[PDB]
Amino acid sequence: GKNIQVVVRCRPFNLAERKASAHSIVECDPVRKEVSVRTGGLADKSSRKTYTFDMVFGASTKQIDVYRSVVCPILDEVIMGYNCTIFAYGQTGTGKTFTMEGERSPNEEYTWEEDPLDGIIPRTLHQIFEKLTDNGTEFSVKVSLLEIYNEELFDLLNPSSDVSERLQMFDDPRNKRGVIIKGLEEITVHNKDEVYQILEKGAAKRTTAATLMNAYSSRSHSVFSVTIHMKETTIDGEELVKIGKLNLVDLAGSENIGRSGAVDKRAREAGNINQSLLTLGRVITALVERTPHVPYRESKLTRILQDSLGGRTRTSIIATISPASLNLEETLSTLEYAHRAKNILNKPE
């Protein structure tokens, strides 16, 4: 089913990897939607595995390419009144956060909205304001940013929370698929430029969080949500009301998720964070295969996203990998995970 998409983004070789003279073991064919990884020893050319996805982005792919292929078709649905999710999944250091958030280009050269290094979040907020303005619709934008760490929920947008008070999740009595997270702060964004300070405060609150908690931000899931209340009036009479929602999910690093058949796999995958990643896999698979049992309850992440994941929706996963020999096992495990989420057969060579 086309409503759930799985894509892979390979990042360029970094400086660490080039100074270790790491080998480049990954090949991405965009046209064939294939990613092939040399799986064997230093000299073994013959030995390679191939996987097929909805899309594949090689190392020269820029932020804009990712946004237009993956994001923009989804944003169209959100603005049409739906509730949609995009995940970034992958080993620590592979670009989950670069993809979701992005970076500032050097010197002064860009307004934040025009910076080509922008990731999904800034691009999305920019487009919501620009597009709804051009359409003449009346709208408002609200945002919240929830972090998940050791099963505890944290609001990163609460200035006065300060800091590490945990929120409380309840089933929503008025929504069978919904939860209410008690005291989660949804900030209203009156003017597009305000997101910058809101999120800059979020980052400082996030930096603080790292100073007390163990391996924070590699082990945490971050859920950014934008809700848009929109009102249009048609040519003849009608006032029209729609609520769209977009979840942008930067997942805990996948480094301890094993490939199948791995020696120590159970031991490595122990702990709440690793199991939440696996639970998510199960939910996605069950949604793709359309099996009746989809286990949303077995993690906090999937309880929070159930409402989005289970409706008339678009859901994409961006699986980020390193090109390097330093990363081989983690890259293969990421591809296996992505492949298990949505099973796409290799086309004939």
Ligand X SMILES: Nc1ncnc2c1ncn2[C@@H]1O[C@H](COP(=O)(O)OP(=O)(O)O)[C@@H](O)[C@H]1O
Ligand Y SMILES: Cc1ccc(C(=O)N(CCCN)[C@@H](c2oc3cc(Cl)ccc3c(=O)c2Cc2ccccc2)C(C)C)cc1
DSSP code of 296?
Answer: G
Residue 258 binds to ligand Y (criterion: CB under 6 A): no
Q: How far apart are alpha carbons 141 and 305 in whole angstroms?
A: 19
Task: Say if residues 156 and 147 touch (Cβ distance below 8 Å).
Answer: yes
Is 91 annotated as contributing to ligand binding?
A: yes
Distances from the Cα of 11 to the Cαs of 38, 60, 66, 116, 320, in angstroms? 16, 8, 12, 16, 7
Q: How far is the CB of 320 from ligand X (least distance, A)?
A: 6
Looking only at residues 317 through 336 of this chain, which bind Cl ion when binding is defined by CB under 5 A? Answer: 325
- Nearer of residues 68 and 347 to ligand X, judged by Cβ: 68
Contact string 296-325 vs ligand X (x = CB under 6 A): ------------------------x-----
Element (H, E) at 196: helix 194-211
**Of 13 and 129, which has the nearer Cβ to ligand X?**
13
Phi, psi of 301 (to 5 degrees): -55, -55
DSSP class per residue in 263-281: TTHHHHT-SHHHHHHHHHH
Spell out, one character per residue from 29 to 58, where the chain touches Cl ion: x when CB under 5 A holds, - when not. Answer: -------------x----------------
Give the number of other Cβ atoms within 10 Å of residue 48's Cβ.
14
Instruction: By CB under 6 A, tell whether 97 contacts ligand X.
Output: yes
User: Of Cl ion, Co ion, ligand X, none, which one does residue 224 interact with (CB within 5 to 8 Å by kind)?
Assistant: none
CB 157 within 8 A of CB 187: yes
Nearest to 121 by CA among 38, 57, 198: 198
Output 167 or 278, the one with its CB closest to ligand Y: 167
Residues 205-234 binding Cl ion (CB under 5 A) are none
Distance between alpha carbon 170 and the CA centroid of its chain, in Å? Answer: 24
- Which member of 13, 14, 77, 131 binds ligand X (CB under 6 A)? 14
CA-to-CA distance for 112 and 339, rounded, in angstroms? Answer: 35
Residue nearest to Co ion (CB): 58
Mapped onto helix, strand or coil, the DSSP state of residue 216 is coil
For Cl ion, the closer of residues 96 and 300 by Cβ is 300
Indicate which of ligand Y, ligand X, Cl ion, none lies near residue 145 (CB less than 5 to 8 Å, by partner kind). Answer: ligand Y
User: Of these, 28, 153, 189, 195, which contacts ligand Y (CB under 6 A)?
Assistant: 195
Show the tokens assigned to 114: 């025009």
Q: Does 28 bind Co ion (CB under 5 A)?
A: yes
Interaction site with Cl ion (CB under 5 A): 42, 295, 325
Q: Which residues bind ligand Y (CB under 6 A)?
A: 97, 101-104, 112, 115, 118, 121-122, 125, 145, 156, 195-196, 199-200, 202-203, 206
